[PDB]
Ligand binder design. Structure first.
Ligand SMILES: [Cl-]
Ligand SMILES: [Cl-]
Lengths: 297, 296
C-alpha cells in the first residue's frame, strides 16, 4: 500500500470508542478532512498537500473505516450514527488540543460534518460539504427515480446479514463498480490506481463491510430521525459553510444543492464543479482551489 | 426434481419467442395459471388439483423462467416486459386452441395477467391477480418506508451485471431468504420442500438469474411506462376481475381493492390471512376463492 501523503505523519488517536487513524501534515489553523463510502482517508491525497500549504491538515479514517478501530455496534447502530461519529471525532480532536477547527467532508464524512455542526457548532470555525444534501432531504426525495439512482441507501440498510452475504461473493467488483459508476468517465481512470488499491483492500475485509452496512442502517433510521428533529425545529447551521457539488453527482440529482443547503444553514456559499461524485479525485485542482480560498477567508 | 402434479401431462409449446413449458390437467373451461419471482410453475401444486376438478388447467412457466426458453434480452429488456410476455403466452394458448380463456397470476405472472387484460381484453373471460398492485402503483408509492420494505425492485433493476454479480456468490442463500421473508411466519415452513428445491435449482442457473433481473429492469422502465400510459389515459380493464391479497403480503403494505377499482371497471376482492405466497401458504382458501370466482 502506497504512501500518498508526502510530508505527512501517521497517528493513531485514542478515544473512548476506539482509535482514529489519521495522516497529519502542515502547520497553521487546524483543518479536519473526512472521507466517505466506499473509501478511506486516502481519497484526499490529491488536495491535502495544497491545503497543508496553509493549514495543519488532519486526514482521518471515519470510526470503523480504514485503519480506525471498529467499535461494537448495537440494535440501533449507535456508534455508526453520524451523531456518535461526530462525538468520537470531537474526542479525537481534543487529544490533539483542537477544540475549534475547520472541517471538510465528502459522502458519509460530510454527513458526520453537518451533524457535527448542528450538534456542536462551537467546535467549527468553517464547514465544507462535498457532493451531499442532508440525509433527511435524500429520503424525502426517495421517489422511483431516486430509489433507482441511490438504491444502495435501501439495499445496504436491509437487516443483516442480507447485504453482508451478497457483498462477500465478489467485493472487489462491487467497490470498483461503485467508484466507476459515479465518475464523469464511467471507469476508474479518474482515480490513482494506488488509491483504488487502498479502497479495495479495506472493502475486502468482511468486518469493514459490516461497518459500512451499519453506517447505512443508521442513515435509514437514527440519522434520519435526528435530521427530522432539526427540520421540524427550523434549526439551521450557523457556522460559515461551503457546499460543493459535482455537475453530474448525487446531490444535484433531485434537488438544487445551494437552494437545499440555504434551508439548513444561515451562511452558506456554493459552487458546482465539473465532476462526478468524487470531487477531490476527479477534479483535484478545482476542489483544492475552492477549499483553500474558502478556509483562508 | 419431483413431479408435484400427479396425473397432469407436460407440454413444450412453441411460440415465435421461444418454448413455454406447462403442466396440463383437468377438463372443462381453460384456465391459465402464471407464477412469479423467485418461483416456477410448481408454486400452483397445492391448488391445481382442486382447480382441475372444474377446469382444464394450464400451469405455465413464464418466458425465461423454469423450463421455458430464455430469449436474449436487449437494451429495453423487451422480451421480459409484461407486454411481450403476455403476447408470447397468447401465442402459446393459441397453439392449444385457446383464444378466450380464464387467467390467474401471482407476483410477476399477475403483472403479465393485468397487462394482457389491458392490451388484449378479448382474450380473457375473467382475470384473477394474487398479492399485487399495478407496477405503476408500486412506484408511485415510493418513499422512504416503501423503499426500505421492498428494496429488491430497485436493487434487481440496477444495470447489469451488478445484481447478477452479487447474486452469483451464494445464490441458494438469497432465494431461500426471499422465499422465507415474504411468508406470514418468516420461514420456509409454508412450502413443500420439494417445491423449494425446484425454486432453488432454477435460481442456481446464472442465465435464469439474469432473466429475473431483466424482468425487474422491465418492471422499473418499460412496464412502468406502459402502465403510466394507461392510468394517465384513464384506461380501465373491462374483464371481470378478482384481486386476492395476503393480509401480511406485499400489496397491502395500500388498500388493494380500492387501488384496483382505479384500474378495472368490474373488480371484486378479498384478503386472506397469509403472507405473499397465497397458493402455498393458504391453498384451500385460495383454491376455493378461484373456483368460486371462475365458476360464477
Ligand atoms: Cl453519502
Ligand atoms: Cl405490488
Amino acid at each position: 500500500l502506497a504512501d500518498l501523503f508526502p510530508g505527512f505523519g501517521s497517528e493513531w488517536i485514542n478515544t473512548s470508542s476506539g482509535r482514529i487513524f489519521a495522516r497529519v501534515g502542515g502547520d497553521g489553523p487546524p483543518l479536519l478532512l473526512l472521507h466517505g463510502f466506499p473509501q478511506t482517508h486516502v481519497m484526499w491525497h490529491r488536495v491535502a498537500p495544497k491545503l497543508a500549504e496553509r493549514f495543519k491538515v488532519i486526514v482521518a479514517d471515519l470510526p470503523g473505516y480504514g485503519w480506525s478501530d471498529m467499535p461494537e455496534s448495537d440494535e440501533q447502530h449507535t456508534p455508526y450514527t453520524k451523531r456518535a461519529m461526530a462525538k468520537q471525532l470531537i474526542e479525537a480532536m481534543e487529544q490533539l488540543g483542537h477544540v475549534h477547527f475547520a472541517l471538510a467532508g465528502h459522502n458519509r464524512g460530510a454527513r458526520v460534518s453537518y451533524r457535527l455542526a448542528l450538534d456542536s457548532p462551537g467546535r467549527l470555525s468553517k464547514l465544507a460539504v462535498l457532493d451531499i444534501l442532508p440525509t433527511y432531504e435524500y429520503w424525502q426525495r426517495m421517489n422511483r427515480a431516486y430509489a433507482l439512482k441511490i438504491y444502495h441507501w435501501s439495499f445496504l440498510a436491509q437487516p443483516a446479514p442480507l447485504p453482508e452475504n451478497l457483498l462477500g461473493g465478489d467485493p472487489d467488483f462491487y467497490v470498483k463498480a461503485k467508484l466507476a459508476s459515479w465518475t464523469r468517465a464511467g471507469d476508474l481512470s479518474a482515480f490513482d490506481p494506488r488509491a483504488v488499491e487502498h479502497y479495495r483492500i479495506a472493502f475486502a475485509d468482511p468486518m469493514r463491510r459490516h461497518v459500512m452496512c451499519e453506517d447505512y442502517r443508521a442513515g435509514a433510521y437514527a440519522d434520519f430521525e435526528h435530521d427530522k428533529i432539526d427540520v421540524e425545529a427550523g434549526n439551521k447551521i450557523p457556522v460559515p459553510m461551503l457546499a460543493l457539488w459535482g455537475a453530474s453527482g448525487i446531490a444535484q440529482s433531485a434537488a438544487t444543492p445551494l437552494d437545499v443547503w440555504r434551508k439548513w444553514a444561515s451562511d452558506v456559499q456554493g459552487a458546482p464543479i465539473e465532476s462526478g461524485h468524487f470531487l477531490p479525485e476527479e477534479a483535484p485542482d478545482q476542489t483544492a482551489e475552492a477549499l483553500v480560498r474558502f478556509f483562508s477567508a
